[PDB]
Amino acid sequence: DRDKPAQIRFSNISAAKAVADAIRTSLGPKGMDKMIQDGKGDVTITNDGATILKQMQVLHPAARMLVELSKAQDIEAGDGTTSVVIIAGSLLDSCTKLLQKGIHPTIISESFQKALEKGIEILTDMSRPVELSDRETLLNSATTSLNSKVVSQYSSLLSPMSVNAVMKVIDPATATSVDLRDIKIVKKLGGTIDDCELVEGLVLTQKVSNSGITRVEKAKIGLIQFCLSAPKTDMDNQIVVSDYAQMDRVLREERAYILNLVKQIKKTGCNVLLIQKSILRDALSDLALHFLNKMKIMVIKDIEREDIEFICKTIGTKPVAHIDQFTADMLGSAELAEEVNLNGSGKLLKITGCASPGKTVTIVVRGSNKLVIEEAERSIHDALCVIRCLVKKRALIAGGGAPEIELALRLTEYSRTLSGMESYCVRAFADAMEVIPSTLAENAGLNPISTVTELRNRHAQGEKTAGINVRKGGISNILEELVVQPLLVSVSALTLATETVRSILKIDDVVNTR
Amino acid sequence: PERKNLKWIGLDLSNGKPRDNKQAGVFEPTIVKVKSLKFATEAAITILRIDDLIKL
Numbered sequence: 001d002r003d004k005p006a007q008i009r010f011s012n013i014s015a016a017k018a019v020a021d022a023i024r025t026s027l028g029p030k031g032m033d034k035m036i037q038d039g040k041g042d043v044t045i046t047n048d049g050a051t052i053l054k055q056m057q058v059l060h061p062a063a064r065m066l067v068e069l070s071k072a073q074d075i076e077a078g079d080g081t082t083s084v085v086i087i088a089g090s091l092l093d094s095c096t097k098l099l100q101k102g103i104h105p106t107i108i109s110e111s112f113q114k115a116l117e118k119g120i121e122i123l124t125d126m127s128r129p130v131e132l133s134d135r136e137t138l139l140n141s142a143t144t145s146l147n148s149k150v151v152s153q154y155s156s157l158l159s160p161m162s163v164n165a166v167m168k169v170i171d172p173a174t175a176t177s178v179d180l181r182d183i184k185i186v187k188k189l190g191g192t193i194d195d196c197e198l199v200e201g202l203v204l205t206q207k208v209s210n211s212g213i214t215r216v217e218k219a220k221i222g223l224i225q226f227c228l229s230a231p232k233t234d235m236d237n238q239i240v241v242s243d244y245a246q247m248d249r250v251l252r253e254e255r256a257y258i259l260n261l262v263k264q265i266k267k268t269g270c271n272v273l274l275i276q277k278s279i280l281r282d283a284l285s286d287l288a289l290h291f292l293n294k295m296k297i298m299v300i301k302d303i304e305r306e307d308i309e310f311i312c313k314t315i316g317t318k319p320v321a322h323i324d325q326f327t328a329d330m331l332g333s334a335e336l337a338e339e340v341n342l343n344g345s346g347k348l349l350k351i352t353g354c355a356s357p358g359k360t361v362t363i364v365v366r367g368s369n370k371l372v373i374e375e376a377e378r379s380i381h382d383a384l385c386v387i388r389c390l391v392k393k394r395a396l397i398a399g400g401g402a403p404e405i406e407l408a409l410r411l412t413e414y415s416r417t418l419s420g421m422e423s424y425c426v427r428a429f430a431d432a433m434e435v436i437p438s439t440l441a442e443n444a445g446l447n448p449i450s451t452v453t454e455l456r457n458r459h460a461q462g463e464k465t466a467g468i469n470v471r472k473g474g475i476s477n478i479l480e481e482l483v484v485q486p487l488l489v490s491v492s493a494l495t496l497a498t499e500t501v502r503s504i505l506k507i508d509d510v511v512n513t514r
Numbered sequence: 515p516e517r518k519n520l521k522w523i524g525l526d527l528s529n530g531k532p533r534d535n536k537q538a539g540v541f542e543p544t545i546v547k548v549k550s551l552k553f554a555t556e557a558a559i560t561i562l563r564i565d566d567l568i569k570l
């Protein structure tokens with residue numbers, strides 16, 4: 001009937017509001033910390049919203065939908081994964097009082113879609129475009145958008161890695177980017193972090209052997225995937241062992257059995273073999289390794305699946321399996337190998353990979369004490385992420401609360417100008433846009449209502465004036481502070497929030513189960 | 515403002531009478547006190563920065 005769907009909608013709205021209010025005092029650089037307690041008694045201090053959203057667990061359709069929305073927002077854009085929850089909560093709080101009066105959800109959804117389209121068009125018409133066909137303007141935009149993510153010393157430390165990673169000019173200013181398609185940043189322990197340089201081909205870190213000379217050029221990779229494990233017995237001891245007889249049998253089975261397979265395999269050119277991880281093999285027979293020491297020995301272990309996928313994509317080959325194989329589709333490229341250490345500990349080999357169809361290049365970073373390596377990794381990750389976000393479009397704008405107030409005033413004037421019963425619903429959107437500046441003013445340590453009123457008055461008087469400052473603690477113009485953000489991080493977020501609100505509003509009736 | 519080396523009397527352990535801790539007192543390293551004050555301030559700031567402890 002009508003009471004059951006109304007109660008279901010009220011319960012869903014209450015659950016969504018509780019989920020949104022469980023975390024709210026964390027937006028901005030001056031956010032509060034939270035100590036999450038584990039099930040065993042361990043406590044962990046954190047302040048990121050994504051970690052708290054992915055760590056906690058709760059069974060509810062609205063909570064699962066919000067988690068999926070946050071995950072999609074973090075995957076698509078990559079920044080600002082906490083404002084969408086507040087936007088959805090404000091929209092649901094507005095829809096609550098909209099439905100309390102007696103309005104059909106179809107008109108409310110149409111008004112929300114119209115308001116979203118108007119806000120998107122206003123954000124696109126207000127933002128200013130830039131250029132990026134050359135390298136000077138691109139480097140200027142990079143150094144202008146990179147000096148506002150972390151602290152000053154960390155920024156100065158990551159600037160060399162940033163300008164080394166931004167030099168990867170492969171796509172000639174296309175529509176989309178492939179920064180997540182052919183990038184494999186490895187990590188190496190030991191040495192100095194200053195010894196970093198872009199490396200093509202392939203980089204490994206496992207010792208080949210320990211014999212005489214191993215400086216050859218035979219494809220430098222063994223395309224083999226068949227089983228190399230020893231045939232396991234049916235039980236411990238099949239018979240009674242004491243004197244000879246049984247000793248000679250096992251001796252011949254250990255010496256004159258796998259050696260025949262090694263001989264029949266080594267009859268083909270390019271004697272390069274390897275193996276994957278030693279997660280299922282108990283112990284490898286060293287007699288086979290001693291017999292393989294002659295006529296050139298080359299073996300590399302500790303190989304994962306991602307390494308195989310990277311090698312099969314950079315070179316441009318396909319692995320083969322099975323034993324009955326009389327083809328010749330397993331060779332590679334021969335150029336140069338056999339590398340030594342770079343004045344320090346830790347074995348690491350590099351291959352530049354000359355004359356190869358795949359121009360994939362990675363960055364080999366280092367560090368010490370496992371303290372500046374992960375930080376630099378996260379820094380270059382955020383760097384290439386914001387670089388891809390900037391190269392995806394061309395529009396940019398500054399943050400602080402001014403665009404939110406501008407959009408709220410525009411929606412208010414549009415609802416005042418546009419006629420129809422839906423305009424009231426549009427007015428609800430006008431009351432669901434002044435949450436970020438109020439939260440920022442509350443977290444800064446000033447009066448939020450007075451600051452919001454002053455910002456609204458300044459926007460109504462001189463259009464584009466200033467916003468909300470954090471370092472100084474007042475109202476200063478943003479043009480002096482080097483801080484900007486792309487337009488996609490707002491447009492995509494607003495569209496996703498509107499879609500989630502429409503999906504959670506269109507779902508009602510009864511919730512049957514099995 | 516008359517001087518900075520004198521007029522720095524303190525407490526005494528033998529009895530409850532102020533005694534000048536210059537002609538017969540025991541000096542203490544200032545770096546130790548500075549590090550202790552810095553650690554105390556850091557601990558106070560860390561404790562005050564903690565909001566809630568609920569499993570979120």
Ligand SMILES: Nc1ncnc2c1ncn2[C@@H]1O[C@H](COP(=O)(O)OP(=O)(O)O)[C@@H](O)[C@H]1O
Nearest residue numbers: 026027028029079080081082399400468470483
């Ligand atoms: N330098 C700055 N000056 C003013 N506001 C800032 C500055 N840096 C960040 N902010 C504000 O902080 C908000 C984001 O805070 P936070 O949630 O900690 O980061 P994220 O959204 O990337 O997770 C943004 O809305 C932005 O307005």
